Swiss-Prot record, chain A:
Molecular function GO labels: ATP binding; ATP hydrolysis activity; ATP-dependent protein disaggregase activity
Protein name according to UniProt: Mitochondrial disaggregase
Subcellular location: Mitochondrion intermembrane space
Full-sequence range covered: 328 to 694 of 707
Function: Functions as a regulatory ATPase and participates in secretion/protein trafficking process. Has ATP-dependent protein disaggregase activity and is required to maintain the solubility of key mitochondrial proteins. Involved in mitochondrial-mediated antiviral innate immunity, activates RIG-I-mediated signal transduction and production of IFNB1 and pro-inflammatory cytokine IL6. Plays a role in granulocyte differentiation.
UniProt effect for mutating E230K: In SCN9; decreased granulocyte differentiation; decreased ATP hydrolysis activity; decreased ATP-dependent protein disaggregase activity; decreased mitochondrial respiration
Further remark: Hexamers display robustness and can tolerate some mutant subunits without loss of activity.
Mutation effect (R81G): In MGCA7B; decreased ATP hydrolysis activity; decreased ATP-dependent protein disaggregase activity; not changed mitochondrial respiration
Transmembrane segments: none
Positions of ATP binding: H19, I21, S56, G57, I58, G59, K60, T61, Q128, N169, R234, R293
Gene Ontology CC entries for this record: cytoplasm; mitochondrial intermembrane space; mitochondrion
Entry's family note: Belongs to the ClpA/ClpB family.
Location of N6-acetyllysine modifications: K262
One GO term (biological process): RIG-I signaling pathway
From Swiss-Prot, chain B:
Additional facts recorded: Hexamers display robustness and can tolerate some mutant subunits without loss of activity.
Residue span of region Regulatory: 179-207
Organism of provenance: Homo sapiens
Consequence of substituting A263V: In MGCA7B; loss of ATP hydrolysis activity; loss of ATP-dependent protein disaggregase activity
Subunit text: Homododecamer when substrate-bound; the homododecamer consists of 2 homohexamers stacked head-to-head via ANK repeat-mediated interactions. The active substrate-bound form is likely to exist in a dynamic equilibrium between homohexamers and homododecamers. Homotetradecamer in the unbound state which is remodeled upon substrate binding into the homododecamer. Interacts with PHB and PHB2. Interacts with MAVS; the interaction is enhanced by Sendai virus infection.
Notes on the domains: The ankyrin-repeat region is necessary for ATP-dependent protein disaggregase activity. It plays an important role in stabilizing the substrate-bound homododecamer by mediating contacts between the two homohexamers.
Name of this protein: Mitochondrial disaggregase
Outcome, altering R300C: In MGCA7B; uncertain significance
Gene name of this polypeptide: CLPB
Cellular localisation: Mitochondrion intermembrane space
Effect of substituting R233Q: In SCN9; decreased mitochondrial respiration
Post-translational modification note: Proteolytically cleaved by protease PARL. ATP-dependent protein disaggregase activity is stimulated by PARL-mediated cleavage of the N-terminal autoinhibitory peptide.
Length: 352, 349, 353
């Protein structure tokens, strides 16, 4: 009975927003799909299958990780990551099932069926399914249609309540092109709205995928790649993803510096402060093609190197406060510098 | 709810902001794209254009600006293939890849991959004159139904694509008949002015007659492309008229505006020019080579000595320049640059 | 019994004459061969092979598409349309039968053989067979002989019940010239019978191609192009297509204007109406060499562009009706047609574009 109050007081959409920012249309559709599971309007005879498409770096595995953290407490037993990049050969179906009878290796058992029987409510993610050979997809079509497995010993494993996600990268640049095209049309009409001063109607930058772009472009490509129409017809949910916008990327820079300041405060009580020009230069030091990995390890390289060289020669006492500021030589146009806030509010420089 | 943009700033304005003197061609392609975007065009067959004109008249840039209008500065929506590579019969393999059992089979076809990644992409076949006629034979399916089949047997879809082919066939004939029609129009306007009923002159564009389109140009089109099938699949055969003097002035003004914009962005130097410099730059116009004949002649009378000025440090930042005609060469021909200083003093460079 | 009843109440000729207009000898000969196939009056060990010869933009590809749509309601599976422009070189035979064992596409198999393996009663349309290399055409020797084909994995396939239709424009100019000459001769004889007061005989314009023109002109150019006097032997019929006359082109103009009226009504509730001068101005600028395709483009720029523009400035509300009217100032009789709104009180209002 308490699960209803925990659901209403703590909706998952806010928490999935607060872990991963951006992809608000994707967050909304996975929130609607998960909400249409537990309130009694669902299919028990079909396992819930999520098919996560999108580009790189922007976040699919972490989003599904937070989904499994939401539905299951433990991230070990209820959270299984099968790497379909490993399975690229015909006999790897044995790793799905087991050895044939009359042959050795049958005594070890089947790994996936043991994972699904030991943890029936677990969340299983398939990473890099594009390189999987077609026959392991066929042994997955057995689960994808029926949800029941038989191993070489003959034992029966039911997998309905388990939650299945496949993360793929087919037509990532294509969905990126449709997102960028609809965003370009939105920008070109929004500049007309600014010119006509039409501020009465609220403007949302939660731009979603168009309805007729996905059937014109993406569906014949997926029919050519997956080779089965029944695979594309049997899917419970397909979630498409979009490249990050401009202000959301500034929020991402703020988010990365936010956990870096949180880690400094938790380890040695250090409070960081940042400027908008630092965020501008970091967005300049970002790569669109592989997403937020660029901004994550760029913030890891830029600011953490300077505080690490400060800690190596003990220029960072605990309990003080730091500011990061673009250097005045590079503020014309990039080198950034650290400044210590004194009790007299004097900006101490560094000589490392 | 983008149709309001189509009400406020159509294709004709965007093309006339980049392409001048081709108002008939702009009107034709704008009407066809307007018919396509309003849901008023059959989606069974793709829209096919064939631009015929003299060189340097703006056919390739009209195709490029058309692609910019559709896909908004996106690299994928503009599939450009130069057909000048496709001079032999086996070059068709470059479209579709090799058959099974052959080298390059797993790579697949190039145009097929580019049209699979974007089916509504604008495909520009540059220089369809320059390809072999048997290479154009593969265009029959792709223009009739947008149905191209791969090396591996997969079939792509091009039902909503826009194909634009540039050519130089009958360029001498088109240019000669256009200048002859402008000449007789000028003569008949002057003759009607002799009784003071000739201020109408003509329309802005020369209406190329259907009799001239069928009895003259079409035999050369049939003779070079060797096939009435390929000409039948072409939805709009769009003719480009050569420039007359009024838009030659505007064209020289556009080039000089670009070279004034090359400064002031990184040197803070302005460039100002009179009308007689525009007259003596229109004077060096070659009919055979088109606007490109102007485009690399303008610097020959404007920028090169200006380049020498940048080698002689005669242009600091903040100068005010003026290109005028030489007094001794007023034959009409060299030009000379001057700097006007803040106390209204002219210094000849 | 039920299929015989269905063929009795409406033959193939009525359905395809609805879908394709003109070409009466072509549809008659094709429907006769199909009727021989359907009623069990044919040698089952030989597949039925057609070569569609005629001008461009006449309807050969459309007629064979309509025939394959008549055979199966599912035209995705039982209609194998292979385009011969991909097959301009000899090694493109590897697209048909697949690669030999030991090469990159061997496990994929032959592309034609797998589609014929899915269904062996399919209509295979070899589009533009003039364009393929003749050594590629040498594989249709064993396709047309006993209806068998060997895959790259050694598994032969049977195609005894399949129907193979090729289309080409070999001798397009000769067929069009001879058909125009025969039309001129028939019109001369008709006006002579009018001048001789002979009009009691119903002489329809079903012009037939003589055997002497087939054997004198079409056969040497066919043997010069296909370069083998054994490929043409296995072709069961040479179906002949003719350029349109005036009334057929008028019916084509009315057909496409009916199509645009149907689209306007079913998408935006717009009723269209036109006069006979509309058909005259949509037939006058006709090119024979582009056939029906030329007529289509004449409907496209003269009328449909004005419809799209008049939609763009928002002059076409739901339920309104338009009349297409020839221009008075071009009564030049490229002209122009005007769109006139008819209101509730049957008044004519010209619309500005
Ligand atoms: N939008 C984001 N917000 C916050 N952190 C992010 C974001 N994107 C990536 N990260 C961080 O970077 C890591 C990258 O993992 P993530 O699952 O987000 O990437 P991905 O795009 O799914 O990866 P891959 O392309 O390899 O499938 C995350 O674990 C997280 O720490
Ligand atoms: N309408 C125009 N008027 C004047 N100059 C133009 C116009 N369009 C383009 N130009 C300029 O002239 C150059 C030549 O144009 P473009 O490359 O389109 O050639 P073209 O007319 O298609 O001829 P060709 O087919 O022989 O290449 C362009 O690079 C541009 O700088
Ligand atoms: N006789 C006709 N009756 C009705 N529609 C026709 C006719 N001929 C052509 N069409 C229309 O024009 C299109 C072109 O026809 P189709 O491709 O069959 O012509 P074709 O003469 O066989 O072609 P090709 O140029 O390859 O020889 C058809 O799909 C149809 O829409
Ligand atoms: Mg990931
Ligand atoms: Mg060019
Ligand atoms: Mg055809």
């Amino acid at each position: 009975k308490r699960e209803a109050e925990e659901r209403r007081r703590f909706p998952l959409e806010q928490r999935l927003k607060e872990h991963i920012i951006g992809q608000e249309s994707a967050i909304a559709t996975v929130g609607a799909a998960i909400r249409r599971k537990e309130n009694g309007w669902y299919d028990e005879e079909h396992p819930l299958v999520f098919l996560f498409l999108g580009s790189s770096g922007i976040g699919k595995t972490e989003l599904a990780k937070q989904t499994a953290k939401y539905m299951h407490k433990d991230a070990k037993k209820g959270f299984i990551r099968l790497d379909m990049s490993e399975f690229q050969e015909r006999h790897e179906v044995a790793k799905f099932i087991g050895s044939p009878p009359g042959y050795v290796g049958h005594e070890e058992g089947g790994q996936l069926t043991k994972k699904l029987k030991q943890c029936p409510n677990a969340v299983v993610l398939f990473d890099q399914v594009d390189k999987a050979h077609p026959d392991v997809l066929t042994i997955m079509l057995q689960l994808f249609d029926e949800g029941r497995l038989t191993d070489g010993k003959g034992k029966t494993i039911d997998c309905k309540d388990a939650i299945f996600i496949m993360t793929s990268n087919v037509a990532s640049d294509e969905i990126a092109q449709h997102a960028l095209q609809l965003r370009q049309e939105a920008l070109e009409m929004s500049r007309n709205r600014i010119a006509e001063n039409l501020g009465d109607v609220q403007i949302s930058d939660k731009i979603t995928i168009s309805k007729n772009f996905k059937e014109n472009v993406i569906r014949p490509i997926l029919k050519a790649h997956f080779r089965r129409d029944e695979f594309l017809g049997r899917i419970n949910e397909i979630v498409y993803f979009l490249p990050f916008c401009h202000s959301e990327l500034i929020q991402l820079v703020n988010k990365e510096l936010n956990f870096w300041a949180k880690r400094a405060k938790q380890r040695h009580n250090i409070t960081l402060l940042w400027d908008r020009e630092v965020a501008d230069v970091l967005v300049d030091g970002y790569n669109v093609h592989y997403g937020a990995r660029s901004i994550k390890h760029e913030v890891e390289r830029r600011v953490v190197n300077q505080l690490a060289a400060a800690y190596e020669q003990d220029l960072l006492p605990g309990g003080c406060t730091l500011r990061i500021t673009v250097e005045d030589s590079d503020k014309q146009l990039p080198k950034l510098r650290l400044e210590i806030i004194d009790k007299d509010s004097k900006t101490r420089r560094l000589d490392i």
